[PDB]
């Protein structure tokens, strides 16, 4: 058993949990671009974060595709070996520049609150695939937040 693999049957993800996000994930797309934007106002508003803001220009741009692709591959999987191999991957880039691990606290509750909405967006009129949606999503950011955090040892 991967380590991967062992996060994965800690918080009970599934087949349905995949099916889920997938259903998501043509309805939350199009927001992806405003979602990106947003988590990075969250950065500029917050005196800390914003002390990673050293790349100019480019790095506005850098930012805001990297969250975009982020959010795509978050909620199109897979999720497997490659893809928390890579999540493994992006948490060391922000290990190797000195961000605080408590940042990611606040960083994953804007995605799970704006993802939320997204959910509710799409599915208050078909209440068991909202549910079953909101469920997935706890499950895949505790995984994502528990992979990042990982790589700060
Ligand atoms: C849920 C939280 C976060 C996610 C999912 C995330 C995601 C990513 C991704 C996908 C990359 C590109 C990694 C690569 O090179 O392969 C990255 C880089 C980076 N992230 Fe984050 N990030 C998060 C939080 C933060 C926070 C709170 C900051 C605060 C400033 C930050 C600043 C950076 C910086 C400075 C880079 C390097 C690239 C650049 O400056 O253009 N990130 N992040």
Known sequence: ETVF???????????????????????????FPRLAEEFYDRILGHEGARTALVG??????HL????????????????????????????????????????????MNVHRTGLARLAYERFHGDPPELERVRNALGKVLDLELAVMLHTYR
């Open 56 to 61: 100019g220009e480019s790095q506005v741009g």
């Open 64 to 107: 805001k595709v990297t969250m975009i692709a982020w959010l795509d591959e978050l909620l199109g999987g897979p999720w497997d070996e490659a893809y928390w191999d890579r999540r493994y991957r992006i948490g060391r880039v922000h290990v190797r520049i000195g961000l605080p691990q408590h940042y990611m606290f606040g960083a």
């Open 5 to 31: 693999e062992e996060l994965k049957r800690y918080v009970g993800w599934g087949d349905g949990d995949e099916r889920a996000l997938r259903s998501l994930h043509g309805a939350a797309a199009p927001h």
